[PDB]
């Protein structure tokens, strides 16, 4: 059981890679930096809130945070004629008539730490570039899911695994030293090429080593290790407030993992109408579950008012989800539990639309229920997908079904970030529709 610790570490360290954007890429409050505002504030003695009151454009009806975050007044603050009580009052009849311009001189972020958003200025016009951080990782996942099988077929298995683990560790450490956004994106793609391949290889090894009398228990323990990795990520993110500090502390543990040492065809899946239907349903279920999981995590990261405690509470509820899945697998079945778990997540996403922002105590409960639901659904599907295919084409079908997860991971970040700008509740509407459809579709599969 000595190698069990390192094989579980291989899965625990995979958590910060796919979920670390919540802490490495947070967006703090910001406004246009102005050169003459600071001197006037020191002259008059403005408090931090009074400076925002007197300088940044107001919100107005319907929120409209765009005018305050991406625009500024072009008034010459260097003029001594400005009164300390209200400098904008004597300039015009109303503040709406003042000229506006972009933040030419930069931005001011109200945070003690840092992130990729604050360092690369991924705000306003460039705000879509933050979505590329996860899309590049998921494109790397998709390409690796094809490349790694070819590499392992034409090269030594153990040497290939060692090489991929070393590549992942080196790319993770190097990304903490990235000088610009393009190199960071390239390192992210390189890391995503090998991360999921290594995770799947470790899972396959740990399932092959253990006999049939304990395969399910170890498979569940593999996800328990991911949950423990999420908890450790939350702790490290609380301890290290800078994104470069957090990135090194995430990648370095995988280095000690190496330091511890020192024919089926694609056309087959759709040749039969029943097999075609099962393949389509499994593809849709994998896509829906991946979209729901990633979107819920990103939405929590983007809208929660207490990120650390919400993330900790959401991560913990996965463990009861794993226990419930384990109890329900051998007593009830696979179709009804999966349908119920998907319906629970869909209903939780639907309810969160109407909850008022001040009812945080209920919002966190609904979020935890939804996370437990998607966790149970994923645990069920990880067995349903595998056991619904014959042994001859089981692995190829599993790979094809899992590629839909990577495609959904590619698409998801633009749904959560960009579509929320059009309307805040729209991503939740999409998630509710997808969850309800997944609940409905699941019933068609045979028991
Ligand atoms: C991005 C992403 N990461 C992991 C999983 C699957 N998964 C592995 S461990 C775990 C939590 C315990 O069940 C889950 C959901 C997924 N579907 N999407």
From Swiss-Prot:
What happens on changing residue 397 to A? No changes in MPP(+) uptake
Provide the reaction this enzyme catalyses.
1-methylnicotinamide(out) = 1-methylnicotinamide(in); dopamine(out) = dopamine(in); serotonin(out) = serotonin(in); (R)-adrenaline(out) = (R)-adrenaline(in)
What the record says about the induction of its expression is: In the liver activated by HNF4A and suppressed by bile acids via NR0B2. Increased by cholesterol treatment in hepatocyte cells.
Q: Which CDD domains match?
A: MFS_SLC22A1_2_3
Q: Provide a GO biological process annotation.
A: monoamine transport
For this chain, the Swiss-Prot or TrEMBL PTM comment says: Phosphorylated.
Q: What is this protein called?
A: Solute carrier family 22 member 1
Q: Which organism is the protein's source?
A: Homo sapiens (Human)
